[PDB]
């Protein structure tokens, strides 16, 4: 397939609840494939693919995992237990419908 997209991996720093039909819902720590950023002219919204579903994601809750640099893992377990409040930043706004 023609690579019309960035196809990079990004990690969720916070979870997300999809409120729009275009949006992806995921958990903190999940990995999604970023296809483009500022998609549809929606500044701050990043088009990604997760579980075979495509959709926009608030970029300020995502971290591009730039694979230009080697990094060894910490190995410090993986329970992901939120034992304290980890309040997420607000998502950017959206327009009055698809143009």
Give a short summary of the structure.
The protein is mostly beta strands and 99 residues long. It has strands at residues 8-12, 31-37, 45-50, 53-58, 62-64.
Could you outline the blueprint of secondary structure elements for this entry?
Elements: E1 8-12, E2 31-37, E3 45-50, E4 53-58, E5 62-64
Antiparallel strand pairs: 1-2, 1-5, 2-3, 3-4
Organism: Homo sapiens (Human)
Protein name: Breast cancer anti-estrogen resistance protein 1
Family: Belongs to the CAS family.
Describe this protein's structure.
By secondary structure, the protein is mainly β. It has one domain (1-99). 0% of the residues lie in helices and 27% in strands. It contains no helices and 5 strands. It has strands spanning 8-12, 31-37, 45-50, 53-58, 62-64. The protein has a 5-stranded antiparallel sheet with strand order 4-3-2-1-5, with no helix packed on it. Strand 3 (45-50) and strand 4 (53-58) form a beta hairpin. It is globular, with a radius of gyration of 14 Å. The protein starts with 7 loop residues before the first strand and ends in a 35-residue tail after the last strand. It comes from Homo sapiens (Human). This is Breast cancer anti-estrogen resistance protein 1. It is found in: Cell junction, Focal adhesion; Cell projection, Axon; Cytoplasm.
């Amino acid at each position: 397939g023609s690579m019309k997209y960035l196809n990079v991996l990004a990690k969720a720093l916070y979870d997300n609840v999809a409120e729009s039909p275009d949006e992806l819902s995921f958990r903190k720590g999940d990995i999604m494939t970023v296809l483009e950023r500022d998609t549809q002219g929606l500044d701050g919204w990043w088009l990604c693919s997760l579980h075979g579903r495509q959709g926009i994601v608030p970029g300020n809750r995502l971290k591009i995992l730039v694979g230009m640099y080697d990094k060894k893992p910490a190995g410090s377990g993986g329970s992901g237990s939120g034992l304290t409040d980890e309040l997420a930043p607000p998502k950017p706004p959206l327009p009055e419908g698809e143009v």
